[PDB]
Amino acid sequence: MKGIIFNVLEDMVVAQCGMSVWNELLEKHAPKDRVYVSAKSYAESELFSIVQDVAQRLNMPIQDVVKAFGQFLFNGLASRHTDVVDKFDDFTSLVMGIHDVIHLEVNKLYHEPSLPHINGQLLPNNQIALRYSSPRRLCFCAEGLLFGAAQHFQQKIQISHDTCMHTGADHCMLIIELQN
């Protein structure tokens, strides 16, 4: 888990709960004197432990917190990597470009990143079928990021997530319908 993800999480937690809460979370869940360097890889367990704590504090499902973070995360990534996002003229182009374009540019900018397996099909009814697979099981973060990307492009969307790893499947299937 690259530090940039933790950095955007910090922005969210600090903005919503204050720096003392963020530092408390780091004391509880990260090694002593932890500082998240954007380019460096960290144990994904640190991220999950932090988000698990937040979710339990709010008495919410962890996956709803993860989805909220995902939506927040798109702007966090877009802001830090504007050149990458600027490559896309619309929502559909971005989503269909996750596999080819995003994956490439991240591997160019980061040392040994851990990216999900994402594959998109544009269907003749102009729905997008997005397959997700990852050991991290962060499909709800993916769902959140898609909504974030939709907001960015001023595009309204609906997502059906009727196959999911969290129920035992070896992948998730996110059907994205663009609406008016």
Ligand code: HEM
């Ligand atoms: C709708 C658009 C996107 C989706 C669905 C998506 C999906 C994801 C997900 C779900 C993760 C969590 C890791 C995992 O699941 O294994 C991730 C990680 C990541 N994504 Fe994306 N992403 C999107 C856009 C972007 C963009 C625009 C960038 C720009 C650079 C980006 C760069 C990254 C980076 C740097 C990581 C962390 C990799 C690591 O921790 O090693 N993503 N992505």
Ligand SMILES: [Zn+2]
């Ligand atoms: Zn899923």
